[PDB]
Design a protein around this ligand. Sequence first.
Ligand SMILES: COc1cc(OC)c(Cl)c(N2Cc3cnc(NC(C)C)nc3N([C@H]3CCN(C(=O)/C=C/CN(C)C)C3)C2=O)c1Cl
Length: 276
Amino acid sequence: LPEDPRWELPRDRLVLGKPLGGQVVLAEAIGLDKDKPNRVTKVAVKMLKSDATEKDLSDLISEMEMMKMIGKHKNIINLLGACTQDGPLYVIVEYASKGNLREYLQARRPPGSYNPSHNPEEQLSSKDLVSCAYQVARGMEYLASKKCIHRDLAARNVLVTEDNVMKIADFGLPVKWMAPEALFDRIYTHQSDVWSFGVLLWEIFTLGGSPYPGVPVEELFKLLKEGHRMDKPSNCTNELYMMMRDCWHAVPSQRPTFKQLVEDLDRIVALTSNQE
Ligand SMILES: COc1cc(OC)c(Cl)c(N2Cc3cnc(NC(C)C)nc3N([C@H]3CCN(C(=O)/C=C/CN(C)C)C3)C2=O)c1Cl
């Protein structure tokens, strides 16, 4: 594990807090910025579980290294630094205090699809929902432009910051989110990520619903081949349901791109009432 001074942070610049769910902990980093040396930033740190094979370590390393190459964007979870010298590898990334997108949305369901949360939050407006989809699209547009195929895009892999910024997670290395050509043929592409994003949109406008409710895996296989598709969510526009349907085109070349989706979500956002 050789040092990389672009990213290295001395171990003692990091007070490790509580677990987040190898494993990830909340932490405070001191002087993450060279020009703000007496500031503490809240961050998430990944490290290996107490028992962990040689593959675990190399996958962590790959992920970190892959994160380096991909660079920065506000709508992905960004690399902030790493501790590689004085002991166990720690990888330091941005922290999302408001949870993954599925829990965030579920917590914002009206109080009487139930609200699982014992700490419920204010319901989201129509405009907020579309804006959430837009940001996720931008995150994926950025990753796509960097030739990164996510392979497991889902609301569970979008995280929300204190300032309600959506950030794609785990982009660096479940069947109900896979496109058929991925499901059936292990063919993963930007187009199959687009299909997954159709499902993520459905997750959004159901406020974190479960896709294909009551459909067992064995069935789903056939049903997709049969051209089955999820019904519109009760509280979703026709425009946004056609978008989902297009993301779910059987012919992958005929799915829109993330670029295209960003342009459409951009327009739909601006037309969506902020009264609703
Ligand atoms: C970019 O991909 C990553 C790489 C990486 O290490 C190199 C890390 Cl650590 C992450 N993140 C960072 C991260 C940031 N913020 C949070 N906030 C918590 C509260 C969601 N979590 C991060 N985690 C995991 C931590 C567990 N996660 C959950 O969504 C847990 C849900 C269960 N709830 C009941 C809390 C995501 C991650 O895995 C991500 Cl998303």
